[PDB]
Write a protein that binds this DNA or RNA. Sequence first.
DNA 1: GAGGAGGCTTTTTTGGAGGCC
DNA 2: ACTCCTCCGAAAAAACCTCCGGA
Lengths: 133, 132
Amino acid sequence: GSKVEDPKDFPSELLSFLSHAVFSNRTLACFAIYTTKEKAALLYKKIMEKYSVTFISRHNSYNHNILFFLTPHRHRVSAINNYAQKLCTFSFLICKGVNKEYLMYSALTRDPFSVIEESLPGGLKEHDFNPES
Amino acid sequence: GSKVEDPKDFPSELLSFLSHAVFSNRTLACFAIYTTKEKAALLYKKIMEKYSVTFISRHNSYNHNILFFLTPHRHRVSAINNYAQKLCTFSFLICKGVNKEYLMYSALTRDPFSVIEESLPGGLKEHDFNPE
DNA sequence: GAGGAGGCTTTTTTGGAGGCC
DNA sequence: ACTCCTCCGAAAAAACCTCCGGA
Ligand SMILES: [Ca+2]
Ligand SMILES: [Ca+2]
């Protein structure tokens, strides 16, 4: 059952990068979703369409997957979560706002994580999280 | 006079990394100071002692300097500012909490910025802002 | 949900052109 | 030897009010 089998949070390696105030009124434009591989593969396209994302990437996380995305306008975390939870009503799903957007994405590119697919060829680099010059 | 001559904020390249809510009750453990070179050189040591910093670095920023530091316990920005402003009562000084600690320090190491001195040999790397 | 920022809304300034619709 | 009609739309200024949210 879920209490025994499901993760209750993101992997510990990533927690310092996230907002844990999942009910906050402070809107954001960078989010992460932790879920099953089956679900993450479907959600990748759905998120991309629903939120007209500037950028999305899907990452391996041992048996499971993580989505990382950036939106053109800001949203409450509870809004993103509600959309994601209602699409598929089986299995776990953890949704959190990302405070350290570069560090998050960058860690998701390296052991124990890796990129499965992303919406821009070559992905992102530290430069892209600096102001445009 | 100050209104004509002094910077009123950090350089624009760095603003997205900082908290602008300088009067906030929110405590933090990463701060930056923008001031003159002669003030920054003295403050480097004073900060290090007053706040028992885990790390501090002084950076060139065109004619002026920026201090970047990390503290072992959290403080209000106003507390750090109040200490810094009262030490030397001449010239400008801008103090702000840092939201994007790695991006801030990393940008302070590259053109147009550079490291003048720092409290650990070799400084910091992205690995250091990940969990141990 | 304070209080500042910035934007929608409204008023004031402005000046080209009217003359029995 | 030197300051006057009016109407109405556009544009500029000012006022106010919504938005985000102790970031
Ligand atoms: Ca001073
Ligand atoms: Ca709040």
